[PDB]
Paper text:
The molecular function of [name] is unclear. eEF3 and [name] share the same domain architecture, with exception of an additional N-terminal Q/N rich region in [name] that drives the formation of the [NU+] prion when fused to the C-terminal domains of translation termination factor eRF3 (24,25). Using a combination of ribosome profiling, yeast genetics, molecular biology and cryo-EM, we show that [name] [name] is a yeast translational factor involved in translation termination/recycling and its loss leads to ribosome queuing at C-terminal lysine and arginine residues that precede stop codons. Here we demonstrate that [name] binds to ribosomes and plays a role in facilitating translation termination and/or ribosome recycling at stop codons preceded by a codon for the positively charged amino acids lysine or arginine.
Therefore, for solving the structure of [name] locked on the 80S ribosome, we used the EQ2 mutant and ATP instead of using the wild-type protein and AMP-PNP. To determine the binding site of [name] on the ribosome, we incubated [name] 80S ribosomes with [name]ΔQ/N-EQ2 variant in the presence of ATP, and subjected the assembled [name]-ΔQ/N-EQ2-80S complex (hereafter referred to as the [name]–80S complex) to single particle cryo-EM. Further local 3D classification of class 1 and the subsequent refinement of the defined [name]–80S particles (class 2 containing 48 757 particles) yielded a final reconstruction of the [name]–80S complex, with an average resolution of 3.28 Å.
Numbering used by the authors:
A (entry chain Ap): 1 to 25
B (entry chain BB): 2 to 207
C (entry chain Bc): 2 to 82
D (entry chain Bb): 2 to 98
E (entry chain BW): 1 to 87
F (entry chain BD): 34 to 250
G (entry chain BS): 2 to 89, 95 to 126
H (entry chain BY): 2 to 97
The structure:
Amino acid sequence: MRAKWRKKRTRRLKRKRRKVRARSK
Amino acid sequence: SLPATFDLTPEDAQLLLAANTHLGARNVQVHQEPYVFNARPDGVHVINVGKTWEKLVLAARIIAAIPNPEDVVAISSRTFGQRAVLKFAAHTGATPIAGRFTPGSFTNYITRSFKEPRLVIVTDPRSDAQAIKEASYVNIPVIALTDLDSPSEFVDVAIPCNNRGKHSIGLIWYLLAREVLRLRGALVDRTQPWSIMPDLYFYRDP
Amino acid sequence: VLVQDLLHPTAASEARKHKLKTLVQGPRSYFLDVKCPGCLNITTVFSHAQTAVTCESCSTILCTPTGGKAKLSEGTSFRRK
Amino acid sequence: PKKRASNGRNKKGRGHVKPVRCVNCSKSIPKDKAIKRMAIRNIVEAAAVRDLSEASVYPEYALPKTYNKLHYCVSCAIHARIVRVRSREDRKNRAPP
Amino acid sequence: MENDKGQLVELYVPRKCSATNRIIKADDHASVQINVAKVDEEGRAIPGEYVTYALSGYVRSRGESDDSLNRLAQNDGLLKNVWSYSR
Amino acid sequence: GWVPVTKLGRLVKAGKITTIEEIFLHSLPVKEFQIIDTLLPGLQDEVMNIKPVQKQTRAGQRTRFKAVVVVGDSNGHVGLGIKTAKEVAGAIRAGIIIAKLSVIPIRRGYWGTNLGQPHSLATKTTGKCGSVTVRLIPAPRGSGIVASPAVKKLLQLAGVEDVYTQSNGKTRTLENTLKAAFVAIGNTYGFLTPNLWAEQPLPVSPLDIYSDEASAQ
Amino acid sequence: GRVRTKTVKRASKALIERYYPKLTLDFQTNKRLCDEIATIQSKRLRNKIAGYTTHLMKRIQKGPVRGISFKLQEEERERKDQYVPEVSRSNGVLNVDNQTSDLVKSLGLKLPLSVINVSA
Amino acid sequence: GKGKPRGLNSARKLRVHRRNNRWAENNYKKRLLGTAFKSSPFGGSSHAKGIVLEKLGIESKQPNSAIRKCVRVQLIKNGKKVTAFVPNDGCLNFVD
Amino acid sequence: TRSSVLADALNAINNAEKTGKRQVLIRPSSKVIIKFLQVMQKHGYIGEFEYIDDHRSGKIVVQLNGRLNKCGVISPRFNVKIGDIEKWTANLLPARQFGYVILTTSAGIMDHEEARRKHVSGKILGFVY
RNA sequence: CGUUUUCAUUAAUCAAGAACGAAAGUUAGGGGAUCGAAGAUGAUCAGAUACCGUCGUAGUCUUAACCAUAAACUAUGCCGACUAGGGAUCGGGUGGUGUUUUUUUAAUGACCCACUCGGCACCUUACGAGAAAUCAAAGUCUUUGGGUUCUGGGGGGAGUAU
């Protein structure tokens, strides 16, 4: 896939893993 | 090493100045040409004709040093020099190539135009560039009638001339033929106006 | 080219080069003594003066500065020394 | 590798040129890159001038013209105008015709 | 190239360019050798007797062979003009 | 019968040129292989490689064979010819011909004692072809040739006894390696060592002394 | 298309190059000359070669055709490039510039002079 | 000089620079990170003895379509489960 | 900036010798260029040279004769012990029979042969062959 | 650039550190014509969450403050030296019993010719380099050393996890 749409998808992954990890601080 | 009498005679200077051999090329000027003499205003660079005559006697000394007269190749593709090299080939041995050079004539033998010379004289080092490029593959000295803007790569001894011409080209070929016919020749003393007419070498008609 | 005298260059080839790029570098500028015909005494003005050099007695003008050489102000008489 | 030494076009010494719009598709292309041709044409075509200069007071009066400079993009100039595609050795030429 | 007892080995001491003193190789086919006729009194030049030079391929390919032949022919005496040292 | 053209072949065939120092001195171009089959008849050949090269054709492939051949006797001359032909025997024959046209001489010298009968290179030398750089270092007596097998055979046919070799680049390509080494052994007669500093009087070409015996009828 | 091959054209060229007299402009007589002096293995190819020889006769007889010389063309051009008109200095003196005068004064001797004053 | 210092008092830049660039070597990295003692199911040792749990048939991917006869082994010194190939025509009749 | 002046001098000499010239005007002209060129003159690699004195660092015009293949600078003047001369001369000379590794010792600027004869060592400057 | 002014090594490159940094984006006012992520619609299409058409929010603009990324590209660190032929051009200067502007000769400006530094570039070659494309630098390198900074080491995993 196009490298900036993998880059955008990765930022959407990191924005989720920052959210689930924030529920358990 | 000139004995007494290879000097530029005043009649030869009148010939060379009448046929405009000194009116060289314009502001375009290769750095490998110190044969210039004090550029005339409105462009034209006057060529030192004394230097021209000295290089001419030197070239005729080189041409009259080949053991055989026929492994010298006179080259002209330009139509101003075709009759010139043809009458040069008439008087001396000096095989002509007037017009199309037919590459392969020097390198890589078995073609029908296979000349294998020890000297190549070229009327114009730009329009005869393939002969000059091809003579440097097979170890041949190249003489060239050069104007001041003409390239000097792969030419040794050059004659500073005006190859815009219609008068200077046939004259410088005529002077080479006359001078190589004086050296080792059936010819005459100091004065010796050489009954063979000067203008047999010239472009005819249009 | 390939053989030349780099120690005795011709003067015409040397009068055209930059003043730093000659064989020994030296200024192409000079001085000149000026007299304004109103006064009597002479004064020594640089060729590339950069100041409004006025005459010694009558302070009027002798040269207005410019980009390069100074301009002598049209009623003058100058000698390069 | 590099397909042109002057990469798209004609920017050496700037860093940024202000873009114009293509006249066909309105794609915004830099002004030095674009493709630029000045259309200089009469307001009458070569058939109409006879019947128009018949139909006029003030005899023939001007033949007045029309001038506009067309900036194309690389796509829409190839799609019609100045295209064909030149060979690697005929690419380096810059004489118009 | 010699050895312990005097003897020349290394076949073919090469030629050297008269304008640069560089070795003219065997695979140097732009190199050239120019024979200039010696001229006696009132012309009629002395056949089989030359002043010869050799010019490498690099001197010719750079465009320097004309000024090199002006220099090399002047200070043998074939020319008393064209080449001037202070350029 | 040979019946040559290219006048040097006639000076060779009439016997007026006897050794290839007369050709290698005057830098004469050799166009016919019989010029060196007569002036160097004890020359031995060696086919170094045969590989298939191929061309894509609108229906199928066109496979012709490329042969790398080294000739050279044992006494200071080598040649290296590379030829593709449609058939391997014709490719080897033509590679022998091109290797015979390209015979180069070799300046071999000493490691550093002036003792009898030179064994090694006079200088450090280097040849590049493609990406392969082949560097030859002079070596003491009895070193052998410290080289790859193809370079070792090219330097063996040269007559070099002791040499050291370094190499850089993709030396697995045999053509560029052999050609880099062929440059590295042809460049030994270009290095101006100080025993060659003494001036020589520039001899006349054999094409002028025997001008009569050239220039056929 | 009536484009004639290189067989017809090269044989026609070679027939004119050595038989320019004998080879008139009529097809029906060149048809018999190509029967006499050449050996052509067909009648159709004979007629084609004869027609092209007649054609090249028709355009030789209004000036030269590039490529073909037989005897008479080269004899004429041989006796044409020997020319009279010569040139001179007979029409006055040698007109020069200022700088050509400086040149001849710097090297040579007293030659006739007429300086000019051309500028930019 | 193209990329590196050269002056005589510059050996510290050269030392620290090569010491930094050594980490891009795979061998140096795996020798100075101790991959052998923590990862790599042996101890970094050569051979290791273990106990057969079950027999597996591993299908060869892509080419060489066959069933390579392997066993699943639990190592004694680690307890690490490890698949190990049993090489020859037969020899799964010898392991049990 | 100009960090070495010998390096500029020897690269000028190398380019003019590669290109077939017979003359080099060197911009920088130190004492060490004078002694380096004096050794190159002693072993025949250059002709005469002439120090032109402006009231500044000075210039030199060197005459060339074609015998020079390469002259080069070793840019950090590495401290050479007398056992390391054979290491240098094996490294950067074409053969053991010619070419000189030039080095500045407290007994002067000299080639490695005179350095072996006088039994002196020091720092390396360059090499000529 | 000019300079026969001054000081006299004050310099070169740079971990750490600092200033500036397109667009989008963020915070708070102002502004909001145009275009216009989102959104809503009309067709197309097998479907059309798209291309094409219409409308339009944030945005586009500005003030105060963030952000610190771009194919931020010449995908070419910076300083210095040398090596090649050409003609254009921009800025400065020098020369011309040169053109133009008449007032009557001038004077300036513009131009022309020649030279000169300093730029943005270009053209032809290749001595040279290169794996080649190509390169007056990507040359002056196995004949390897002018000074210095940063970066890389098979492809992924991954600029991911921590």
